[PDB]
Design a binder for this molecule. Structure first.
Ligand SMILES: [Ca+2]
Ligand SMILES: [Mg+2]
Length: 223
């Protein structure tokens, strides 16, 4: 996250870190047994780490659970990143408490202008590399689809939305992939892609979760 702030330990209780010997993507806990992340974060051998703040220090509130199965969206296209969503089932159910909580799925899609909270352990420099050990947060509004489409011609589908600042300076970045975009208490997006990080007129692009609620509900109930 570039231009964001330190969230504070366990202030984003639904935030997950996907680890395969190191942190490589974020995710969101939707109930005690399932996590939603981005399909481009797919890897075999994932351990889900819950209740994390510093990912390099065991501070006491962590729960490390391996994944039993991963399900990438049936129509995920790795070339366009269209339908960039995946579900991860935990081998054991997590113990929900104040530090580990699930986030609600939306009943409707959010409107442009809505302010959201984006979080992650990704790069914090637009030009450079600085990976933080604690969770960073960023408040950003959903942008109109027109400004999103003018920035990325012929690349935005109805399953994507842009959030951010066209002036640049504030954005999600690599290492934040798969993490949550929560607006009005609901998970509305998944960190998916963008052009560099925090560049002028290049906002971040997010998977539009409101379009996948039936697939998510149907899939977790049958697995
Ligand atoms: Ca830790
Ligand atoms: Mg993240």
């Amino acid at each position: 996250i570039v231009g964001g702030y330190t969230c504070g330990a366990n202030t984003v209780p639904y935030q997950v870190s996907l680890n395969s010997g190191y942190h490589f993507c974020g995710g969101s806990l939707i109930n005690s047994q399932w996590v939603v992340s981005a399909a481009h974060c797919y890897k075999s051998g994932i351990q889900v780490r819950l209740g994390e703040d510093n990912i390099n220090v065991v501070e006491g509130n962590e729960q490390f659970i391996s994944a039993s199965k991963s399900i990438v969206h049936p129509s995920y296209n790795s070339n366009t990143l269209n339908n960039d969503i995946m579900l991860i089932k935990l081998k054991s159910a997590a113990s929900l408490n104040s530090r580990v909580a699930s986030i609600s799925l939306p009943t409707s899609c959010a409107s442009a202008g809505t302010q959201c909270l984006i979080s992650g352990w990704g790069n914090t420099k637009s030009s450079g590399t600085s990976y933080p050990d604690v969770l960073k947060c960023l408040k950003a509004p959903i942008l109109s689809d027109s400004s999103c489409k003018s920035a990325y011609p012929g690349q935005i589908t109805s399953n994507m939305f842009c959030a951010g600042y066209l002036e640049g300076g504030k954005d999600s970045c690599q290492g934040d992939s798969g993490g949550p975009v929560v607006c009005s208490g609901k998970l509305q997006g998944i960190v998916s892609w963008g052009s560099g990080c925090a560049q002028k007129n290049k906002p971040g692009v997010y998977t539009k979760v409101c379009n996948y609620v039936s697939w998510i509900k149907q899939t977790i109930a049958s697995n």
